[PDB]
């Protein structure tokens, strides 16, 4: 929940207003910016908070396995079924094959799963949250994302700022992560960051955002290993000698 940058606080405000709706929300942001945490917040601030919160990463599964995991087969209940009365979070949405996109639109618009065999369709009641860092309108133009799915899925859009655009939050979060690492390795006090360390942290572009910042800071505190003088060496790249 860390951050004071205006851009982040505006996201939290937006989320508070979107959460009670049953409308789909699209979250745009880089890796490590907190997208799944925001999806979770949408669920727990909604009327569905006692229902299930289910997640699925679309990039992780090949096309036939993604189809079965999302819509079910035979049985093997899919993630829409498991999310009935709750919220389903679809991460890396732009990697979904076009077959899955069309089937997703069908579920959104008709509210049921189709299914094979003698079974009747399964009606489902699921609040959808999706995330990506792709330019979805650009993909629509290329024919790699369905325009009709976007016209429907993007009821509203939450844009999470990358850490490099929340420059004020870098030192706040670095200090928080450093202190927790000091507890983990039993140092009595975090001895601070030198100006060199601060320059290194603030100049780096953080392609992995908060996840990367946490790891870099934890590693740096461990390598420093003392409370006797301030931390000077920020180890961004551990693959260097
Ligand atoms: N506002 C925040 N304050 C503190 N930690 C955060 C914040 N946002 C994200 N994190 C942390 O950064 C890491 C990445 O968060 P996550 O929600 O998985 O990002 P994404 O889903 O975009 O990859 C997690 O360890 C999470 O706890």
Swiss-Prot record:
Q: Does the keyword Nucleotide-binding apply?
A: yes
Q: Which organism is it from?
A: Escherichia coli (strain K12)
Q: Where is the Sigma-54 factor interaction domain?
A: 8-221
Main localization category? cytoplasm
Which positions are annotated as binding ATP? 29-36, 83-92
What does the protein in this record do? Transcriptional activator for the phage shock protein (psp) operon (pspABCDE) and pspG gene.
Native organism taxonomy: Bacteria, Pseudomonadati, Pseudomonadota, Gammaproteobacteria, Enterobacterales
**What is the protein name given in its UniProt record?**
Psp operon transcriptional activator
Q: What top-level branch of life does the organism fall under?
A: Bacteria
Q: Name one GO cellular component term.
A: transcription regulator complex
What are the GO BP annotations of this UniProt entry?
Answer: negative regulation of DNA-templated transcription; phosphorelay signal transduction system; positive regulation of DNA-templated transcription; regulation of cellular response to stress; regulation of DNA-templated transcription
Activity regulation: the record says: ATPase activity is inhibited by interaction with PspA. Under inducing conditions, the interaction is disrupted, allowing activation of psp transcription.
Tell me the keywords, alphabetical order.
Answer: Activator, ATP-binding, Cytoplasm, DNA-binding, Nucleotide-binding, Transcription, Transcription regulation, Two-component regulatory system
**What is its quaternary makeup?**
Forms a complex with PspA, which is composed of around 6 PspF subunits and 6 PspA subunits.
GO MF assignments: ATP binding; ATP hydrolysis activity; cis-regulatory region sequence-specific DNA binding; DNA binding; DNA-binding transcription activator activity; identical protein binding; sequence-specific DNA binding
Coiled-coil segments, which residues? none
Localization in the cell: Cytoplasm
């Amino acid at each position: 929940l860390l951050g004071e940058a205006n851009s982040f606080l505006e996201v939290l405000e937006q989320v508070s207003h979107l959460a009670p709706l049953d409308k789909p929300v699209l979250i745009i942001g880089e890796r490590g910016t907190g997208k799944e945490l925001i999806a979770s917040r949408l669920h727990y601030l909604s009327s569905r908070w006692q229902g299930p919160f289910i997640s699925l990463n679309c990039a992780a599964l090949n096309e036939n396995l993604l189809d079965s995991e999302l819509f079910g087969h035979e049985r093997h209940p899919g993630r829409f079924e498991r999310a009935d009365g709750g919220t389903l979070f679809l991460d890396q949405l732009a990697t979904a094959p076009m077959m899955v996109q069309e089937k997703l639109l069908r579920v959104i618009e008709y509210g049921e799963l189709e299914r094979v065999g003698g079974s009747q369709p399964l009606q489902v009641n699921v609040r959808l949250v999706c995330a990506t860092n792709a330019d979805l309108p650009a993909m629509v133009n290329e024919g790699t994302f369905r325009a009709d799915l976007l016209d429907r899925l993007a009821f509203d859009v939450v844009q999470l700022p990358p850490l490099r655009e929340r420059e004020s939050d870098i030192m706040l979060m670095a200090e928080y992560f450093a202190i927790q690492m000091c507890r983990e390795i039993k140092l009595p006090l975090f001895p601070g960051f030198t100006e060199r360390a601060r320059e290194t942290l603030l100049n780096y572009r953080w392609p992995g955002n908060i996840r990367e910042l946490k790891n870099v800071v934890e590693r740096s505190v461990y390598r420093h290993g003392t409370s006797d003088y301030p931390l000077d060496d920020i180890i961004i790249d551990p693959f260097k000698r």
